[PDB]
Design a protein around this ligand. Structure first.
Ligand SMILES: CC(=O)N[C@H]1[C@@H](OP(=O)(O)OP(=O)(O)OC[C@H]2O[C@@H](n3ccc(=O)[nH]c3=O)[C@H](O)[C@@H]2O)O[C@H](CO)[C@@H](O)[C@@H]1O
Ligand SMILES: CC(=O)N[C@H]1[C@@H](OP(=O)(O)OP(=O)(O)OC[C@H]2O[C@@H](n3ccc(=O)[nH]c3=O)[C@H](O)[C@@H]2O)O[C@H](CO)[C@@H](O)[C@@H]1O
Ligand SMILES: CC(=O)N[C@H]1[C@@H](OP(=O)(O)OP(=O)(O)OC[C@H]2O[C@@H](n3ccc(=O)[nH]c3=O)[C@H](O)[C@@H]2O)O[C@H](CO)[C@@H](O)[C@@H]1O
Ligand SMILES: [Co+2]
Ligand SMILES: [Co+2]
Ligand SMILES: [Co+2]
Ligand SMILES: [Co+2]
Ligand SMILES: [Mg+2]
Ligand SMILES: [Mg+2]
Ligand SMILES: [Mg+2]
Ligand SMILES: [Mg+2]
Lengths: 452, 452, 452
């Protein structure tokens, strides 16, 4: 039986942002969403999130996540940011007075922490009968982490914060993950002896280590060798470094599953995105939100797709697109903009300098050049001439061939198999198999240039 | 006298691809093409490629490479993938029964291996009178490589595969390159004593090391310090890592020859591409296939060119182009698409949101805006107005100035020095120095807006 | 009292460039400009730049920098590139015969050197009463640097150049920064004993170390732990590596100040660029010259802006722009080209496949699609229809709505609240509230397709 507390009530001053720290994103989720997904998979009996100033702006996000994850998540309020030890004390108040399960604590700014690392923690805590088990790791650059102090015995003595450490203690490379498991009674007891006489004038959760050691209680450190899983984010530099590490891992999982990613370093893939076998992804590409790519696609350099579905065997090159679907075998790009509600059929083509918004385009239809399609439905096997505009519902049937430089002034219906001449303004319905024209005849003015 | 065997008959299961492993590409060539180019420069007397399932899909590629490299390359068939030792046995069957030259073996998935490393191998093998010489290297991450086992003497004892190694042997950082030279008699003799009682149930070439050591034969390891040259590719993660290392080396060679590459990490340059002195290459750029760039060019950010020739002093910025030439001093981009058969003269200009396909455009001609040029020939010093379309041969002469929003309905000829008015549909020939028009006159409807 | 000499008269052969080495750029400034900015902040009494061949092409750049930095900078000429010791001798001739201040020497190809490192140097030189103080650092790859030779005592003995070092001395990882402070008398005295009998046949400044040690003079090495600050640039590979290190530091400073940079590795930010709090910068972005970005902007993937001002809350996505301003709340992109003299008002919109050149566009005005705006002034709250061209002054008033496929043949005035029909060629003034039209009526030709 375990209760997990997430400390998320700090002011996040080092982010220098008007967005609460724990709402900053990587790979398609806030740090708080990453942390809650990992814990929810671990499925503890209780899950409590400590919130502070701006609890108004965060608590709703937590409620949405509770639904999505289909479990209860309690919010405990911490009025003033008195320190991580104080935050835990606030967190404990959402538990019953007589709770006897283990208490796991972690921060909202350790967003790679995973369900396995948490389960191992609880497993080592239970195995060694610890009063406190602390996750640690070792880093080439330990700046800003609490340093782990050990006796000659290699026994854990204390955690000393960066601001409080000596120059010589700052060289210690073993760090506090800030992820812990506690016997609850031992935790209550240590928390009531915290004082804030330290460099930050805060009530440090980390002091409980030394306090419990005082009492002869069992204090266990568990080393996490994969440092990233417990890496923290205090500022935007660390946020970007961790986003990059997470992205390499996401790309690697796709590569091992059968996706060619020519250049992992310039391919950003959000966590929910799925990609089919074979699919080749070219450099400078972001696949964002719930984008789904099928098999044997080419997703060409410099493409950004957010919530876009792409079938198998499709080509989507130098394209910027959101909330759109692209059918099997279709060709999009280069230099194509898809706005929400675009649906392009199998074997369809949207070519260079084409933008589509809220339009359905049927199987095998091509819009190859310099055209805007807005709020229109176009049938199958049709061909829209270069440099045309759907001036916003206009319906265009199947096997239609419209001439270059046609404007379609909505609303208008173009029947199946109809043609339009080059340079037509279409303001009225065009019967099936009719040709609609409006351009006047060419006149040549001989020797105009000699004269003028 | 040496015979080189390339083992290329494995199923490549870890690639998770329906394309045979050895056909996956980096920097413009398949791994198999990289390996065969390196060996062909070494010019051994015999060159034998062992192929397996899908030999149908690969053997033709090998025949093409034999021609290109102007030498014979024999294909030996290995019916079932019984292991690397079995593959070598199959390879040896393409040699005469009584062959007496050295036998060099390497894999099809070590694509950075070069002619110099091979020549050094053969040189150390001959110098030390070895029965087997094995190339090794040492790696921070040796996962998946055979580990080199040495006595106290530092003498090579055995190679143990990843799947067969103990946890303690897995820590060994010295690895088997999988590149070997053998005395042929010693090789035949060891191969006939291989058994497949190991973790993969395969006939391991690597066992021949321990077998020859059994027989008191001379076993030599030659350390390759530049690890990349002998790095292997079993999966798409390794393929991308090696593609990135190869690309840094290709960019570095251009930089040292006089090319500014602002950002090597986001500049992909295929092996056959040539680039002139001074040329500045901006980030997010791929230069692919047989692209040739002259001197003092700017190849602007976010450009992809495949088989494109660009003269000296030209600017090619945010451009996506294939099978096209761009003359000296010409300006292309930003946001320009060149489709095959585009030829732009010296000092020509193809501007933003312009696409050209299968058209010749003469010296000093400008197509600056929002225009599609298809299947057309345009003369020298002409100017094509913005937002125009060549509606597909149309021929346009020299010193022509065509007005914005002109459609040219092929086939049509526009004589030298002719003009077109804005908004003309040109369906007939236009004499030299004539002005062609078709737009009707402007009518102003006063107070229309108050009313409607 | 100190005099600083910058050695900038070498031929720069390893750059393989027709542009003098010291004029190659990183982050918006030449190496020589970086070096002179750092020294000018240190504000020494004398500042002397030694120039050689091509002094004609560089001395003017130095004069401009003297003004900008508002101080005197003397140019000393070195006729032939006889070596760094000779260059210093030439530099000293711009000082009075009887100068008694310290002499600081540094090269023009150490462009990260900063005012603090220089001030520390002068401080250690004065503290230890040295005849020479040399900055050193230690590098994993010391290729091409002079190696620091020390006695058992850890005392500095000599500097040995790469070309002159033994294989065993080449393993030395402590290197000469090529940044020095000297007692002037000791420097004059050592320089007069230099000989050029060495591998490069040059007069090495580095020999003065061993010469002064000869004379029992005090020779001090000061170790710079941040190696980059003293890293040198002899070729384009090193230039790009240093440009990348400088760029990571510039991005990091913005991140710590409150700017989200999703991908530092593919975000290039020149040194003078300012960016407001919150602003999110997406991958594949260059912000160049004196670009200024306000707060809460999104500067979307694949954007290059040079000298562009962007207000607060604006969106500038897949945009290529120079010498332009974009007002607060405005939306630009994706696929938008801004040419010099573009001014877009607050809440304005320039959409996909739109190019603007030398035009002012008023508050709240939208040019959303496939349009060229050149040399035009457009008022407030107006809407320019898709696929239109300003055929170049044309003035368009406020609350205007122009139909798709309108050509504006300059010069022309469109009054406030006027409309244009789709497919209008506007060649004359349009009164306020008038509707201007020119397209002929649609004609449908029934059964044309059955027949033709
Ligand atoms: C004293 C302490 O705990 N320091 C640890 C903390 O440092 P660090 O300085 O990173 O701790 P933070 O300031 O990020 O705060 C910890 C977390 O608890 C929450 N919070 C913080 C203060 C508060 O009054 N109320 C509150 O709820 C915040 O949301 C924050 O996410 O994590 C590091 C790893 O990331 C560890 O190496 C440190 O040992
Ligand atoms: C037992 C063995 O050799 N292992 C070596 C092999 O591991 P590794 O596991 O990489 O060997 P692979 O499975 O890649 O097969 C070797 C190559 O031989 C060919 N092939 C393979 C099996 C087969 O039955 N027929 C066939 O022709 C394949 O095309 C393949 O390219 O290379 C590594 C370096 O890359 C070495 O460190 C290993 O010591
Ligand atoms: C002998 C010497 O000094 N070598 C140093 C020099 O090597 P390095 O070989 O880099 O020295 P360079 O060839 O770059 O020349 C030094 C600088 O002085 C100027 N110059 C050079 C030659 C000349 O005749 N006249 C002239 O004015 C050049 O502009 C150049 O920028 O810098 C390295 C660090 O970057 C140091 O590790 C080396 O100890
Ligand atoms: Co923290
Ligand atoms: Co028109
Ligand atoms: Co392999
Ligand atoms: Co130098
Ligand atoms: Mg804090
Ligand atoms: Mg295998
Ligand atoms: Mg030199
Ligand atoms: Mg038009």
């Amino acid at each position: 039986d375990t209760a997990v507390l997430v400390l998320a009530a700090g002011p996040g001053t080092r982010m220098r942002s008007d967005t609460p720290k724990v709402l900053h994103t990587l790979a398609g989720r806030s740090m708080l969403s990453h942390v809650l997904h990992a814990i929810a998979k671990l499925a503890p009996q209780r899950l409590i999130v400590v919130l502070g100033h701006d609890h108004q702006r965060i608590a709703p996000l937590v409620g949405e996540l509770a639904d999505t994850l289909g479990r209860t998540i309690d919010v405990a309020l911490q009025d003033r940011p008195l320190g991580t030890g104080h935050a835990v004390l606030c967190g404990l108040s959402a538990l019953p007075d007589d709770y006897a399960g283990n208490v796991v604590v972690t921060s909202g700014d350790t967003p790679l922490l995973d369900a396995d690392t948490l389960a191992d923690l609880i497993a080592t805590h239970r195995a060694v009968s610890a009063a406190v088990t602390v996750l640690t790791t070792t880093l080439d650059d330990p700046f800003g982490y609490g340093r782990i102090l050990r006796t000659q015995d290699h026994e854990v003595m204390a955690i000393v914060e960066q601001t409080d450490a000596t120059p010589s203690q700052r060289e210690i490379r073993e760090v506090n993950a800030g992820v812990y498991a506690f016997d609850i009674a031992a935790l209550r007891s240590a928390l009531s002896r915290l004082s804030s006489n330290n460099a930050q004038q805060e009530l440090y959760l980390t002091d409980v280590i030394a306090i419990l050691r005082s009492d002869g209680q069992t204090v266990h450190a568990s080393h996490v060798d994969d440092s990233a899983l417990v890496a923290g984010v205090n500022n935007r530099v660390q946020l970007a470094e961790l986003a990059s590490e997470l992205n390499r891992r996401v790309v690697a999982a796709h590569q091992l599953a059968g996706v060619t990613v020519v250049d992992p370093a310039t391919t950003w893939i959000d966590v929910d995105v799925t990609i089919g076998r074979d699919t080749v992804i070219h450099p400078g590409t972001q696949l964002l939100g719930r984008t789904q790519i099928g098999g044997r696609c080419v997703v060409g350099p410099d493409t950004t797709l957010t919530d876009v579905a792409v079938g198998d065997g499709a080509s989507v090159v130098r394209t910027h697109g959101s909330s759109s679907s692209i059918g099997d075998g279709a060709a999009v790009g280069p230099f194509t903009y898809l706005r929400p509600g675009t649906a392009l059929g199998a074997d369809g083509k949207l070519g260079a300098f084409v933008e589509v918004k809220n339009s359905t385009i049927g199987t095998g239809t091509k819009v190859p050049h310099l055209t805007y399609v807005g709020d229109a439905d176009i049938g199958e096997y049709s061909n829209i001439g270069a440099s045309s505009v759907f001036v916003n519902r206009t319906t265009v049937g199947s096997h239609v061939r419209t001439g270059s430089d046609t404007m379609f002034v909505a609303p208008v219906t173009i029947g199946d198999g109809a043609y339009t001449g080059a340079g037509t303004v279409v303001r009225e319905d065009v019967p099936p198999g009719a040709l609609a024209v409006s351009a006047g005849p060419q006149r040549n003015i001989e020797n105009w240039v000699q004269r003028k």
